[PDB]
From Swiss-Prot:
NCBIfam families registered for this protein in UniProt: dCTP_deam (TIGR02274)
GO BP of this protein: dUMP biosynthetic process; dUTP biosynthetic process; nucleobase-containing small molecule interconversion
Keywords tagged on the record: Hydrolase, Nucleotide metabolism, Nucleotide-binding
Pathway annotation from the record: Pyrimidine metabolism; dUMP biosynthesis; dUMP from dCTP (dUTP route): step 1/2
Known EC number: 3.5.4.13
Sequence similarity: Belongs to the dCTP deaminase family.
Quaternary structure (record): Homotrimer.
Reactions the enzyme catalyzes: dCTP + H2O + H(+) = dUTP + NH4(+)
Residues the record marks as active site: E136
Keyword Nucleotide-binding (UniProt): yes
Positions contributing to dCTP binding: K110, S111, T112, Y113, A114, R115, T134, L135, E136, Q155, Y169
Protein's UniProt name: dCTP deaminase
């Protein structure tokens, strides 16, 4: 696993993460407490942006992962997304990533969300992939649940291999 020193180096020298903060940010401009984001000891706490897609089952009968349909989501833009009970929403990160050929990442939800039964599911970032990261949130509780935009939601952990891969994501 790569360290906070390494993450900093990669952000500043190779634009791995943009926008990037070198430390933990634990409060907003006003001093209001937020779910923290930024560089961590052995990872990076990513933020949720304010554009959400809330799943709706209205007028549908089946979830078909091979036929992803924007029609089964309600667009919501705002500071706090409300996920219906026992259902899910999608969002994207504030951060844009550019992953080196030598790196794979995994991403795990923060305790703030997990402890309330909100499970963030993010798939590994592949070497030479670039993009905003798609976040999914399963609300596994029987009440509506809040997700706070512009604040931390998950921690990305960065692994390097002993061998460069033959075929990267770009190849």
């Amino acid at each position: 696993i790569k360290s906070d020193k390494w993450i900093r180096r990669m952000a500043e020298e190779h634009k791995m993460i943009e926008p990037f903060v070198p430390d933990q940010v634990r409060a907003a401009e006003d001093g209001r407490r937020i779910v923290s984001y930024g560089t961590s000891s052995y990872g990076y706490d990513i933020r949720c942006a304010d554009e959400f897609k809330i799943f709706t089952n209205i007028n549908s009968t089946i979830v078909d992962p091979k036929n992803f349909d924007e029609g089964s989501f309600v667009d919501f833009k705002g500071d706090v997304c409300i996920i219906p009970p026992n259902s899910f929403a999608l969002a994207r990160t504030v951060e844009y990533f550019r992953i080196p050929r030598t790196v794979l990442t995994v991403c795990l939800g923060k305790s703030t969300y997990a402890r309330c039964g909100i499970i963030v599911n993010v798939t590994p970032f592949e070497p030479e992939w670039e993009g905003y990261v798609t976040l999914e949130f399963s609300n596994t509780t029987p009440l509506p649940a809040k997700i706070y935009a512009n604040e931390g939601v998950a921690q990305v952990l960065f692994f390097e291999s002993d061998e460069v891969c033959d075929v990267s994501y770009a190849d």
